[PDB]
Amino acid sequence: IPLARTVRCNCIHIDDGPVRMRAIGKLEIIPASLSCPRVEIIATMKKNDEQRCLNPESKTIKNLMKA
Amino acid sequence: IPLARTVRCNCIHIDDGPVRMRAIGKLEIIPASLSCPRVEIIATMKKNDEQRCLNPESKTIKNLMKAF
Amino acid sequence: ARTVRCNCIHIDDGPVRMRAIGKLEIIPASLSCPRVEIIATMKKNDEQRCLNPESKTIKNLMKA
Amino acid sequence: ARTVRCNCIHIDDGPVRMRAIGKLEIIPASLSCPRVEIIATMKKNDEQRCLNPESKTIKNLMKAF
């Protein structure tokens, strides 16, 4: 809880409306790094392979992730 | 996202947890800027000075917001 | 007794550009200030001012 | 006829630290690949390799606390 930290991440906007394994093609998890002090979760929906950034801090998201 | 863009924002982690307007001492809304290309919404919970970053794209949040 | 201890002593009405604001604060009604308050930090000079919650330039603006 | 298309040819059972992982691309069990595939891209050389979905170095690495 300081000021603005300059960061470099893939995800800028984080999609909210959840889903389930059924619709998700691939799930890409990216561990926290020096450039992006947070985990990034990018799902590719079989629906036109629409890529969506999810919130790793979200309960549902956590549930879906770990199996 | 065509790639990674260098960005400078107040919010790094978005508490996509729940809430509503009991408590919430204050709610800050920072329009999208050249430095952060998406609006930030910082809530200062009535209790304990604790600050939470809310997802501006969250239906609940857009509705909690469009309620002033 | 009619009493009030709010942050705003002055309420702006002069319409303001969506892009001229740097920050916006919404402090909801309380016993100490039964009225909602919206304080904007303008980009220019970073001057803080209060906008009318009831105003359209605001209701429209509130589609942030 | 018939056909089967999994991405993995080798399954790295050897341990691995979250430290050296760039990312995981977890692919859900499909009709074409009747199991889940977890491809890791090591930080080192950006090397890709498959890890066993049912291995501990993975389950504990499956971070969420």
Numbering used by the authors:
A (entry chain B): 1 to 67
B (entry chain A): 1 to 68
C (entry chain D): 4 to 67
D (entry chain C): 4 to 68
Give the authors' words:
Here, we present the crystal structure of mouse IP-10 at 2.5 Å resolution, which shows a novel oligomeric association. The final model contains four molecules in the asymmetric unit: A (residues 1–68), B (residues 1–67), C (residues 4–68) and D (residues 4–67). In each molecule, the N-terminal extended loop is stabilized by two disulfide bonds between conserved cysteines (9:36 and 11:53). In each of the two dimers, the β1 strands from each monomer associate to form a six-stranded β-sheet with two antiparallel α-helices lying on one face of the β-sheet. The dimers (A–D and B–C) are primarily stabilized by reciprocal interactions between opposing β1 strands. The main-chain hydrogen bonding at the interface is limited to reciprocal interactions between residues Leu27 and Ile29 (thus accounting for four hydrogen bonds) owing to the presence of Pro31, which disrupts the β-structure. In addition to the A–D and B–C dimers, another dimer is formed between molecules A and B in the mouse IP-10 structure. This results in a distinct tetrameric assembly that is formed by the association of two pseudosymmetrical dimers: A–D and B–C. The tetramer has an elongated structure with approximate dimensions of 90 × 40 Å2. Intermolecular contacts in the tetramer are through molecules A and B. The two molecules associate through their N-terminal loops in an antiparallel fashion such that their α-helices lie on one face of the β-strands, while the interacting N-terminal loops are on the back of the strands. The rotation axis parallel to the β-sheets and dissecting the A–B dimer relates chains A and B with a rotation angle of 179.1°, as calculated by LSQMAN. This is a novel association in which the tetramer consists of two six-stranded antiparallel β-sheets, with an antiparallel sheet formed by the N-­terminal regions between the two six-stranded β-­sheets and all four helices lying on one face of the β-sheet. The solvent-accessible area at the interface in the dimer is reduced by 1770 Å2, which is higher than the buried surface area of the pseudosymmetrical dimers A–D and B–C (1280 and 1170 Å2, respectively).
